[PDB]
């Protein structure tokens, strides 16, 4: 079992209100190997500057659950993106196949009473890693109705 820093356990026991944030560092496709770019996202309500990396907060809506058991198998995780964003709708629609097999690193970060991140993981004194792997496909579902409020959700799939 992965032990966590002592102060982490003390904060988790003492504080009943936890302001968690999921920090996503998604790999961005490049035509040639000479380029390497990442897009950083979070579901928190403000940008989180973690290790000098600015995790913007506008887009990510929800994240699925990570599950594993005693038998080796390729676990999967899917997170949703707001389909009203023009950047991501364009990216998924017109580049959603070139995104295959591109990495992603999701961190589960507790935000202190101040904006600092509670150092739970003792190996890096940072957040506790939540997921890591590669994308496998995507999907957008535009859903409008002539009466009411429509919907547009971008769903990514990962392994």
């Amino acid at each position: 079992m992965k032990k966590i820093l002592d102060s982490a356990k003390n904060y988790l026991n003492t504080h009943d209100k936890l302001k968690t944030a999921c920090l996503i560092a998604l790999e961005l496709p490049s035509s040639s190997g000479s380029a390497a770019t990442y897009i950083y996202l979070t579901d928190y309500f403000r940008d989180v500057t973690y290790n000098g990396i600015l995790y913007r907060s506008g887009k990510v809506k929800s994240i699925s659950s990570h599950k594993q058991n005693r038998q080796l198998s390729i676990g999967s995780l899917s997170f949703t993106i707001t389909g009203t964003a023009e950047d991501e709708v364009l990216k998924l629609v017109q580049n959603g196949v070139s995104f295959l097999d591109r990495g992603i690193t999701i961190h589960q970060a507790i935000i202190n009473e101040e904006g600092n991140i509670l150092p739970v993981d003792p190996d890096t004194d940072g957040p506790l890693l939540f997921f890591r792997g590669r994308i496998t496909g995507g999907g957008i579902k535009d859903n409008v109705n002539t009466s009411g409020i429509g919907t547009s959700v971008i769903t990514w799939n990962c392994s």
């Binding site: 309500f45 506008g58 809506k61 707001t82 535009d142 409020i149 429509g150």
Partner: protein, 204 residues
């Protein structure tokens, strides 16, 4: 066709809206971002909705009204209505000699009266192009002599082709009934049809 009303048929004063509800129906892909920002995308077309309520209708007036409505249901055409609160004739003149330069899309519109119209269309009044049956709503007005700059709430559905003529008076909504499937009328012992109401809805 025309929905009967005291203007077309003054002999039936029972016709006429006891209360009219002009609703705005713009579907939108609204999304509430986790950061507090609300993003909404307009894709589906907007359409005015008209809810008409009638006063106590006597048997002959209701006979005329439901005869016209059943003719509507039979021939299957559209049903035009004229809202009277927007019938303030604030613009005199004949609009045939008014040119709208071609190649205009969006809310803004520019039309040249060529010194023909008399009267200023204030904000909140209706507006309709000669060709397309859509009905807009003036939100702001600004004129420099003869040229008029009008801003309309719904974006111009069709780009002006240089021949569309403004219609500042007698604007009719090309609507369709939404109560047709189950439309009943009750007759009281007093001799009047009570609670007659229509849920219209602009088509296209």
């Amino acid at each position: 066709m025309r929905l009967p009303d005291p203007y077309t048929n003054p002999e039936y004063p029972g016709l006429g809206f006891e209360s009219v509800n002009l609703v705005d129906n713009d579907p939108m892909i609204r999304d509430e971002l986790p950061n507090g920002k609300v993003k909404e995308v307009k894709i589906s077309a907007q359409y005015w909705g008209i809810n008409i309520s009638y006063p106590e209708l006597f048997p002959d007036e209701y006979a005329f009204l439901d005869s016209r409505l059943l003719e509507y249901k039979r021939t299957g055409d559209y049903l035009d209505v004229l809202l009277p609160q927007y019938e303030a004739f604030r613009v005199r003149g004949d609009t045939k000699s008014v040119t709208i330069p071609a190649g205009q899309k969006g809310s803004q519109i520019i039309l040249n009266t060529n010194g023909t119209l008399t009267g200023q269309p204030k904000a909140g009044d209706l507006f309709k192009l000669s060709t397309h049956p859509k009905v807009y709503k003036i939100t702001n007005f600004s004129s420099s002599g003869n040229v008029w700059n009008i801003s309309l709430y719904p974006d111009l559905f069709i780009t002006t082709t240089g021949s569309e003529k403004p219609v500042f008076n007698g604007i009719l909504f090309r609507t369709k009934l939404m109560n047709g499937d189950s439309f009943g009328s009750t007759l009281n012992n007093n001799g009047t049809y009570s609670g007659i109401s229509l849920s219209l809805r602009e088509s296209l």
